[PDB]
Amino acid sequence: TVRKNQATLTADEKRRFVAAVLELKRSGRYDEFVRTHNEFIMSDTDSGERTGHRSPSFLPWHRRFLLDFEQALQSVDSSVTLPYWDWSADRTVRASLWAPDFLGGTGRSTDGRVMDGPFAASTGNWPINVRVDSRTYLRRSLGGSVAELPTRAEVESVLAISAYDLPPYNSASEGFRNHLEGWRGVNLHNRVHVWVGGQMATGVSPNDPVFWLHHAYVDKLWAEWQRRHPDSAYVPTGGTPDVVDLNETMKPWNTVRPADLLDHTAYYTFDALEHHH
């Protein structure tokens, strides 16, 4: 139940995380996560029903989605937890994240194909099945479509925003949620998807295992935001068309609300997370 910075995992932890991910893929369970995410990405709209992103529920929805995935990993190896990628600290292609004993590196230039690591197509262990681009190999172009990952100073500027979210509760919103998501402002989470490239830049972005580490860090930043703003809370708080209000249930589960997910410590803690100061 502790989520750790990827940069700090032991060799044993990396091995067990990798092997649990590959077993979820082998058994067919992994690709349904990819498929669920793509369905929300394609359906959520700024002027219609919106649940998994471009909306206040972006954060609790991804928190529950990552919990579902972590629980599946634990069903294979109960010692495994989701690591997080602090892309503000580990910001080059040199990071140990991208080493062949962890996620493998960038894609070669011709066709974006990842050539090393346990998820390289040549292993036979990571077929890309749920897809729009018809190619079936993992692709990346680290730093290709956008020069730099966000910095600590830019993350701090978003963490400083006091309102969780603001009407119209979509990609045009001011407020914390939309600045972290990235549709407005210096852009944190969307830019990271663009920076990895390959499937991470598409609606089938959980095809890349870095998806989970990226979102685990996004989730950590929500927790840091809550510590900075103990007086601010999820909005809206009732009767908002097309938006998940605080105590409304969320698809696809239907049995959980944003209110049930605001406090992560009910499910996990972080290796380090500051107290409100």
Binding site: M42, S171, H193
Partner: protein, 78 residues
Amino acid sequence: AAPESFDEVYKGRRIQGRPAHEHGGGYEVFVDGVQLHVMRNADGSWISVVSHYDPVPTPRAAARAAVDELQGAPLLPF
């Protein structure tokens, strides 16, 4: 109010757009006759399912960004 339709060959591929499990979309794009899911954002920018996190100004720009992403590969239908 819908963008204009278009039809061109871009980096050897036919891209078309027209006003019309995924949202109810007012505009359709095609890459070599296969429909590409695209979406308009509140600020009027567009994205597509193969470049979802990087808004571009128009549906034609999204179709072109999709051809760039595909590097010659056929698109699969959504």
